[PDB]
């Protein structure tokens, strides 16, 4: 349990889709919203 977004949840929410294929999304460090930890 260490899922914390480096960006604001509002912004991570915009990229909540294609998170599986968006490598930059992972680099944005938004494990929440996508549910990927």
Residue 16: closest CA among 28, 25, 5: 25
How determined? NMR
- Going from N- to C-terminal start, the domains of the chain cover 1-37
C-alpha distances out from residue 4 to 9, 24, Å: 9, 16
Q: What is the Cβ-side half-sphere exposure of residue 25, based on CA atoms within 13 angstroms?
A: 20
Distance CA 12, CA 5 (A): 8
Residue 24: closest CA among 34, 10, 3, 1: 34
Compute the radius of gyration of the chain from its Cα atoms: 8
Q: How many helices (H) and strands (E) does the chain have?
A: 2, 0
Report the first-to-last Cα separation within the chain, whole angstroms. Answer: 8
């Amino acid at each position: 349990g260490a899922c914390e977004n480096n960006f604001s949840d509002r912004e991570c929410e915009r990229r909540k889709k294609d998170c599986d294929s968006s490598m930059k999304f992972r680099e944005l460090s938004c494990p929440k919203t996508c549910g990927t930890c």
